[PDB]
Structures are given as C-alpha cells and as structure tokens.
Amino acid sequence: NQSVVVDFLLPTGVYLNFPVSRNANLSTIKQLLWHRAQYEPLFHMLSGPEAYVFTCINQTAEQQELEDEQRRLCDVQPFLPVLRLVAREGDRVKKLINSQISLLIGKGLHEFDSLCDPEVNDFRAKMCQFCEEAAARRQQLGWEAWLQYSFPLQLEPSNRALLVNVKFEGSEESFTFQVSTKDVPLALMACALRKKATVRQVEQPEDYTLQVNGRHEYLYGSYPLCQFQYICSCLHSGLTPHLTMVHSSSILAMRDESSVSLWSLEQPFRIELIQGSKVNADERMKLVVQAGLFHGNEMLCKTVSSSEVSVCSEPVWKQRLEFDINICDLPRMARLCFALYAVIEKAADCPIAWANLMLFDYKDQLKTGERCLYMWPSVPDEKGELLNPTGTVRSNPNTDSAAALLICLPEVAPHPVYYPALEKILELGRHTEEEQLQLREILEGELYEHEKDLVWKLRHEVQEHFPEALARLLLVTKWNKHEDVAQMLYLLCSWPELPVLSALELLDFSFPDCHVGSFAIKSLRKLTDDELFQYLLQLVQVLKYESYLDCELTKFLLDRALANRKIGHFLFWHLRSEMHVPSVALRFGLILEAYCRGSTHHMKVLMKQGEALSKLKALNDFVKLSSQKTPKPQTKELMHLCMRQEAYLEALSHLQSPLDPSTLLAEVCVEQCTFMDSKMKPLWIMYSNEESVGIIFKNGDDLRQDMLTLQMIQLMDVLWKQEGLDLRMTPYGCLPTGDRTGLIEVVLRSDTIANIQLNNKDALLNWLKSKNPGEALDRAIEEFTLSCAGYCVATYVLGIGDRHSDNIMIRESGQLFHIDFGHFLGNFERVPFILTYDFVHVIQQGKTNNSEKFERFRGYCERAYTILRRHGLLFLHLFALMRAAGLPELSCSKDIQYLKDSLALGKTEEEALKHFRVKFNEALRESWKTKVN
Amino acid sequence: YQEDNIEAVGKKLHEYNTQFQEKSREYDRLYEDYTRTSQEIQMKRTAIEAFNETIKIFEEQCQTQERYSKEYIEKFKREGNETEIQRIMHNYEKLKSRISEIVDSRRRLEEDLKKQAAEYREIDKRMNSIKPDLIQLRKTRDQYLMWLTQKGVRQKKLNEWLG
Numbered sequence A: 001n002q003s004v005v006v007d008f009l010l011p012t013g014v015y016l017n018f019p020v021s022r023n024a025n026l027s028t029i030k031q032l033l034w035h036r037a038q039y040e041p042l043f044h045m046l047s048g049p050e051a052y053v054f055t056c057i058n059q060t061a062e063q064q065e066l067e068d069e070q071r072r073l074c075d076v077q078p079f080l081p082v083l084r085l086v087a088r089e090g091d092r093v094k095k096l097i098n099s100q101i102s103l104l105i106g107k108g109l110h111e112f113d114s115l116c117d118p119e120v121n122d123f124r125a126k127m128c129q130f131c132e133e134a135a136a137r138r139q140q141l142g143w144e145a146w147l148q149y150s151f152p153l154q155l156e157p158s159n160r161a162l163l164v165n166v167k168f169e170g171s172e173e174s175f176t177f178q179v180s181t182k183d184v185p186l187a188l189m190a191c192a193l194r195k196k197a198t199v200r201q202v203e204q205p206e207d208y209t210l211q212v213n214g215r216h217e218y219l220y221g222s223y224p225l226c227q228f229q230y231i232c233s234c235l236h237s238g239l240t241p242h243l244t245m246v247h248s249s250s251i252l253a254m255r256d257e258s259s260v261s262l263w264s265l266e267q268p269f270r271i272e273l274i275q276g277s278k279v280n281a282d283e284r285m286k287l288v289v290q291a292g293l294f295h296g297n298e299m300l301c302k303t304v305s306s307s308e309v310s311v312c313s314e315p316v317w318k319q320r321l322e323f324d325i326n327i328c329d330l331p332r333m334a335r336l337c338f339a340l341y342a343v344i345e346k347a348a349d350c351p352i353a354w355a356n357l358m359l360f361d362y363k364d365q366l367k368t369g370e371r372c373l374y375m376w377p378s379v380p381d382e383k384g385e386l387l388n389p390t391g392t393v394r395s396n397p398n399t400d401s402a403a404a405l406l407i408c409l410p411e412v413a414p415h416p417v418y419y420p421a422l423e424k425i426l427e428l429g430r431h432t433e434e435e436q437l438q439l440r441e442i443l444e445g446e447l448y449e450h451e452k453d454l455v456w457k458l459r460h461e462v463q464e465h466f467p468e469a470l471a472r473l474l475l476v477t478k479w480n481k482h483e484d485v486a487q488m489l490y491l492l493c494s495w496p497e498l499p500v501l502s503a504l505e506l507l508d509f510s511f512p513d514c515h516v517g518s519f520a521i522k523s524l525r526k527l528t529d530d531e532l533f534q535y536l537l538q539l540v541q542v543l544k545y546e547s548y549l550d551c552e553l554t555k556f557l558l559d560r561a562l563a564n565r566k567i568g569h570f571l572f573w574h575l576r577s578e579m580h581v582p583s584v585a586l587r588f589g590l591i592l593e594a595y596c597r598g599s600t601h602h603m604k605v606l607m608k609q610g611e612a613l614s615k616l617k618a619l620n621d622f623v624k625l626s627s628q629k630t631p632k633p634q635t636k637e638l639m640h641l642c643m644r645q646e647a648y649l650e651a652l653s654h655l656q657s658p659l660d661p662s663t664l665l666a667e668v669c670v671e672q673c674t675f676m677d678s679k680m681k682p683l684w685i686m687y688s689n690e691e692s693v694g695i696i697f698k699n700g701d702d703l704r705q706d707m708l709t710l711q712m713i714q715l716m717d718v719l720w721k722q723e724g725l726d727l728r729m730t731p732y733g734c735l736p737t738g739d740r741t742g743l744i745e746v747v748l749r750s751d752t753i754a755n756i757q758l759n760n761k762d763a764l765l766n767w768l769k770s771k772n773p774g775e776a777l778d779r780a781i782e783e784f785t786l787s788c789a790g791y792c793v794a795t796y797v798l799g800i801g802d803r804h805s806d807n808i809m810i811r812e813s814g815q816l817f818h819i820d821f822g823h824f825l826g827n828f829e830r831v832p833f834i835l836t837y838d839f840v841h842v843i844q845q846g847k848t849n850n851s852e853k854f855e856r857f858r859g860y861c862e863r864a865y866t867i868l869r870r871h872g873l874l875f876l877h878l879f880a881l882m883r884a885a886g887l888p889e890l891s892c893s894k895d896i897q898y899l900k901d902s903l904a905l906g907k908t909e910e911e912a913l914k915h916f917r918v919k920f921n922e923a924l925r926e927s928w929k930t931k932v933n
Numbered sequence B: 001y002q003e004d005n006i007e008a009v010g011k012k013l014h015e016y017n018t019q020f021q022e023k024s025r026e027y028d029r030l031y032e033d034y035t036r037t038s039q040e041i042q043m044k045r046t047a048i049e050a051f052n053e054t055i056k057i058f059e060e061q062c063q064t065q066e067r068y069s070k071e072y073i074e075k076f077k078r079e080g081n082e083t084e085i086q087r088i089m090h091n092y093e094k095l096k097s098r099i100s101e102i103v104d105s106r107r108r109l110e111e112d113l114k115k116q117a118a119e120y121r122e123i124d125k126r127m128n129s130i131k132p133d134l135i136q137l138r139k140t141r142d143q144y145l146m147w148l149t150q151k152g153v154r155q156k157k158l159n160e161w162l163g
C-alpha cells in the first residue's frame, strides 16, 4: 500500500506515530507533523518547523541529517521509518557530504572508523586533505581552466567548405553560415558575433565558448574544426553542425551551482604458529599449515611446514616455525604467506584456505607481536601451487564467520626496528668484450639461471647500454640478500626515464618493490589524458597487487581524476562497480571517499546516476519475475506502469549518462522502453533530448569481459586512425556499474544480420540499397568493407569465436559491427581467421568476381594486422596487467600466449605477413565450403 | 631403472573428464552459495548495526524526556494541571513500548544471522570435502591425456573423448 507508519521523536522528548505517504517529501511530512504535534504535550516550547532538520538511520547504518526536504521518503530509504528532529546548526556542509559519500560509495564511512586501524586513519586524513586542496585550488581558477577540467576536448586521434548553424544562449534566433574545415573555433565565434552585431552594435570573441546543442561538449582551444569529434562526425555523415555560443559568466554560473639497524640483526627469521579458529574440514583428516616468505612471486627461502594436528574447529599448534633467511636480509616488501591444508594421515591434499601478511608495516616498522589473520578460502585452479603469494595482504572482512590463524612475530630487539631509509640504502649501495657480446644476445623469454648471474655482474652495463632492460635486471636481482637489494636500488635511483610502454610492464605483480612502482609512475606522468584513459581500466586493476593503502599509484590516479572530470567519472565507476568484492571494498571505498571530497560537482551527477541505476535494478527484477508468468506484451505494459510512477520517472529522467557524462539522458520515452529476450531480460531504455539515445541495463552477467574487449577494439581503432586508416568501427559504450550490473550503449539505426536475412539471396545487399538508395550505395558498401576488415582482424587477434547472424549487426550507413563479446582468447583452440561468403558478396558489390574491390579489402585486413603487430607489446602488457581482474578467460600465461601467437610476435614482419596471407586465403577457400553445407 | 590399449584408455579419459566436469559444476554451485551467503551475512550485520543506532536514538529520546519534562511536571503540579502531567507520562510510556518492538525486531535478526552463520560454515565444509575429489579428478584426467599424447594419438581423437 501507499501509506507508512512513521515514528516522530520531538526535541522535547515527545513521541508521535502516524501514517504518511511513501511518496510524500520531507517538507510535506514536516507540515503533517506540525499539524499533529500541536495536539500533543509541550508543543509551545518548540521553535518553528524551519529551525529543525529531520535525522534518520539510513541503509548503511549511519545517522543522516536530511537537509534536502524535497526528497521523497521512499527515496531517503530510512532503515526503519523513524524521523528525529534536531537543531540545524553545526558544520552542515561536512555533515551533508559525509552522508552523501556513504550512500554513493555503497559503504558507510563508519565502517572505516570501526576497524580501529591507523593505516586506514592516516590514509583518509592525508588523501582527503590533498583532494580538498585541489578542489579549493580548482575553484579559484578562471572559467577557461574550469571548462578544461569539467569538459575536456573530445578530439579525433588525428580543406573543404562547411556550413555551421550557430545560435546564442536564450534566443531561438539562429545563424547559418559557411566556415572552412581548418578554421580554429575562435574564428567561428568571431564570425557569429559579427552577424549578431550586424542586426544592436559590442562584445569580444574571447569571452565566448561554443557548445554542441543538447550536449556538454565544447569546442575551444588552438585545434582546427575537423579535429573535433562532433564536427568530424558531422562532416562524414553530411549533417550540418548545430552549435550554441555561451558566455563566460554562464560558465562561471555552472562552476558556482631508533638506535638499532635492521642490518645488525643477523638472527634467522621465525614465527610462532599458535592456533587456528573456525575451521570447517573433514574430521577424519589432519590439519597442516604451509608457510613461506615471498617477494612478489619469488620465494625468498624454502617453505617450512607445521606438524600434523587432528581436524577440529579450533586447532592448536604452538610451534616455532623457523625459516632459512636472516632478519637482516628481509626486503621491504617481504611477504609472509600461509596456506591451511587438510591432509590424509600418513600410514589429493585439500587446500582449505590461505592468508598473506606483510612483514613490515606501512610506516616501515618490522612487525612484532600477535596477529589474527582471517583467511580466504582456496579455490582449486589448474596451477595448484602450495601457497598464494599474489593474493591480497588484506584480511578477510567477514571476521564473524571466516577461518582464522593466530600467529606471533617475536621480539627482535628492545626498541623498534625500521627498514633502512633511502640514504642508508644508497650508502651501502655504491660500488670485457666477450661478456659484452654475451649480454647483447641475452637481451635480444624469461632468463635461465646461468644467464641471471651474467646480467647481475654486468648490471652497470645494463643501466648504461640497455636501459629498456630494467625489468629483466630486477628479476635477476637476489631479493633475499640486502647487499644485492641495496646495489640494485642504487642503480634504480639514477636509472634513466623509460617510455610509457616499459613503465606499464613494471606495474605488474613481479615488481612489488616500492621504488620500482614509484619509478614506473614517474614514467607514466608523461601520459596525456586521452592516452591515460585508454589504460585506466588496467591501472585500476593493479591496485589489487598493492600492499599498503597509501601508494604512488593511488596518488597518481586521484591526481589525474581531480585534474580531469571525465577521468574521475570512469575512475569512480571502475572502483564503484567492485565495492561488492570483499578483497577490494576497503581499498576502493577509501579511494572513492577521497575522490568524492575533491569532486563535489560530479558527486551530484554521480548521485543522480546511482539512483537511476537503483530504480533500473528494481524495474528489471520486476520484469524477470513477470516474464516467467505472463506473455511479453502484458509484461511490457506492466513495465511502463511501474516506470510512470513519480519517484521512478523522476529518478530515471534528466541525468548525465554513465556511459558518457557529456551525453544527457533527458526525457524517458516510456512507450519506446522494453526488454530483450535473452536469459537476464536486459532492459532497453529510450531517451529523447535535442539534436534520441538509448541504454541497455543488464543485471545478472559480469560485463567486465565485454568492457575489456570493447576497449581493446577502441584502442585498435585509435592505433589504426593514428596511421591514417579509419576502418569505421563501432566501439559502443559498455560500463560495469555494480554487482553483475552494467550499462551498454544502444546503437540506433542498426539491425542484426539474422533479422535482415530472415526479412544465395541478396537480402543483405538489398537492405543496404533500401537504406542507401542511388548515389549513397557506393559509400555504404565502402563503409561495410572497411568495417568488415576491422572486425575480421579484431575478432581474429582477440580470439573471439561464436560469431553468428544473431551477434553481428549492420548500421544503415553500411558499417558492420559485432556485439556480445562473452568469450575471447580461443574460448567457447585457435580461432581461425574467418571470412563470411555473404560479406564477400557485399564487398564485391553483388558480383561473382570483383578482384579490384576484393584486393582492396584484403589490403585493409593486411594493413590493419600489420599496425597491431607494431603495437603488440602494448597489448601484451595491458593484458598482463588485466590478469589482476580475475576474469576466468584471462588468468594465466597461456591466455597471454594466445595474443603473442595471433599477432605472430616471435616472427619477423615479412614472416608474419606471409602467414597471415596464407590464413586469409585459406579463410576464403573455407568461406565457399561453409555456405554450401 | 627409469599399461592398456588406446581405445580402453580413451574411454577412461572420457569417463574421468565427464566426472571432472560434473564435480566442477557442483563446486561452482557451492561457490555461488558461498558468495551469496557471505554477501547476505554482511547485509544482516550492517542491519544489526542499523538497529543498534535506531535503539540508541530512542534511548537518547528517553534521556531527553526525563531531563526535560521534570520542570514542566513540577510546574503543572503547582498549577493543579495533573491531567497535563498524565499526558506527558502516557506519551513517554508509548515511546518505551515502541523501543520494545524494535529490540524484538533486532533479536529476530540476530537469530537469523546465527542460522545463516551456521549455513556459511556448512557450505564451506562441503566445499572442503569436494576439493580432494575435484583436484584428484583433474590430475587423473591430465595423466590419461599425457599418456595418449605420448602414444601419438591424434588431436581429433582426443577431442572426441574430451566432451
């Protein structure tokens, strides 16, 4: 029903209880309260209704002061319907933001306090401070700088006439006039300003900016007009650009809307395994604890095992486990890793659970005393290693029910001991042609033991002559010897800056040392915002390999998120979409908090999106439930009735799209909304604004795989466009937003091949003719040809099988594109290069043998392939970092090896191209045979 | 120093692959329950915190009622307005019984969390009993596959047996 019984606690102590509408706003509820409170004791001592604010307990178990009284009660979602009147006064800005952050990040800020963790407290204090300072500094900037922050230029990767429709703000009168394609925006502004003058006549051209009508996209800066994506899109399609002149003030309106060294301790490292807790194992078996010390993926010494005790819930050991390494030789990122095993009594071992521990803390102190390591359960995978050194050093947050190991790190000295400061490391770190020839060939494939000892000897030569081989030298360094670690880090500090490509490799789990990650980030600061955005997904995933909360990578990502609002938008959603994953909830939540505090403007946009997304979840749940009961037309009508409810419609309308924050999702076209017939019943939601745009909301599948694939295809598109090859790709938006939840951009004016063929027929070629009659058909065929080649090469390189008429689409322009990339890297053997007969036929213009056109198509495929090979190491490094994501189809070196083989990186370019040619020709032969069946 | 016909070993490869796929699907189902239950236990635990914070607000209201009302109970006693005293105190009694309803709701949820905590532990126990069979079946499947590869059995024949 509509009404709900709400408890009201007055500041006099008086208590009222009465029904109010779930749709009623808090301002209306306060009026109903005041009218009822006058007939209750002690009314006269109350101040007026505007002197008080309602407080509730919200869904994240925190108190919230309800400052916005235009909010409906059903939107506020109080845990229990209990509203308390309290005094407004106090720091209401900080109170409001603190409460909004909790709801937005999906995790109450109180949960960070409840941990009683200094690392956490130091992170929040330092990062929130830094983010606020940037936010305040940003506010003091001019209108141009703020425009660059909030609406960065959308430029093509990168002379004829072009007429543009220019309009002014708050005026339906518009001006159409000719402009050169290579004109700067400022020249177009000066033109429209003169025509506005030629009517009272005066304003300057510098005070204006240009906006794309019905979008938050802006044309400014020194670039020519055709380099802007909107104009480039307009020039190609043939539509005339529709721009609005916007004043400086209008942009400002938006803005204001002690005496003991570590090296002295020569005793061996050891631990006390005390007790296990809440173990769930087979009672017939026995329990064992494997322990080992690691640096990255390398063992520092041999793995020592506990004794066998009987299986119970609360096993006891009380053993001094000693390791084959001194305390003086432990590196900064030395990692104690445990695995609990249930074993059959000696007279297939079960990996139960695992847990890792940094031996040094976030302030560089070697840890002493007891620890309670709450364990993660072991998943049986193909490479069944004894331990899990790559796994997170953070504890399982399910402290209520998860298994635990209690250990004790002993006292090494009377006073605390720190890992030596940089100055002491560099102090200890200082100090033939045959072996020079041996080094050359070794660096021109991970090194064998005999090769490692040569590279180490000639490490000074590697710095001087082979600076790009830093990664190789770091792997050969003996991280279980402090003398060697000191020497390697001495070289590292003076090491020359490396290209972006090399820096990306150094972010991987093999290079855990803080100085290495710091050197990596230093090399990544070169990155433009456009390039960074291409790697953003990967840079976020490598946060899962970090040991401490306060790290260089987090600082870098926040830095860039605070300087560029588009980067901050997608950083937010990449972190937010993983808040349900307990291993990252804490780390990601802390980054989101700091981000939010430096980004109050975008907080408001993200809030609107989160509420839209929460309504879509409930709308989709209703549709799943309804679809299994009734036929589709009735479910569709029931979907629309649920949508037209005030709270639904308002929450679903007038938001910036999560897929692209410059796109406005204005009015919901409820009659055009529907859902798709696949298993999860994804919702198809249409919007209208000012020149139609659509989104698919999908709940039930993890869309990260699809996002990765589409980002790679987009990167391909960029790399091709950078060499002057536009293969006319449709890398449509895909964005994970939550737990098995995300959005997919709708491509309008497109259909599936199956639908077109369903209606040896010319069905595909006639559909193109019907959509591109007369002179426009040649363009359409050329668009098909270019896009067919791009997607043929893309799908082959990424190993995307299961390609059929249902998941390949065509735009009315002719552009062909693929959808639904649930499988890649040969999953469903090597996926062969594939040509479809029906596509060859469209490429040949409906003729049997059109060698001129076919050879051009072959050329495009071959050039496309050749360009990707030149950037092969970029794809390998990016995929290597994506192994942190934990995608089932990207878990191991075999998955990476798939990409090496498909790009033929072990071959010369000539060799690669000759093999590709054979594969191409063989695909043409196969194309004939497939359709005859 | 340093055991069957090919068709017989291939039949056993097919059987062990079929047993491995089934045991994997059993484990994947359990891991899904494990994942779902861990999320649900977390939600209940924050719900208990929310009850705690709600009960806390109500106890502040009781504290407030007791300090604040005193002067007005004494003032209305001098003026003979004992009915107004009776209204204040009856209103406070209604507050108190509302606190008992909320405490009872918190208790129901603590007992549900208790049951689901035991379910979590039973799910983990079943997972840990499945793992030996799952791992053993993977290793056995791989050994049969290597034996056949050594014997020179073609990839197309191996594919028929592997599902």
Ligand SMILES: Cc1ncc(-c2ccn3ncc(-c4ccc5c(c4)[C@](C)(Cc4ccccc4)C(=O)N5)c3n2)cn1
Pocket (backbone or CB within 6 Å): A674, A675, A676, A677, A684, A696, A732, A744, A745, A746, A747, A748, A750, A751, A752, A755, A819, A820, A821
């Ligand atoms: C995992 C995953 N990834 C990507 C996409 C995905 C991404 C973008 N786009 N852009 C259009 C479609 C699209 C797909 C299928 C169909 C259609 C359109 C029509 C032509 C129209 C229709 C829509 C809804 C209900 C009924 C009819 C049809 O008949 N089938 C699409 N899909 C989907 N799913």
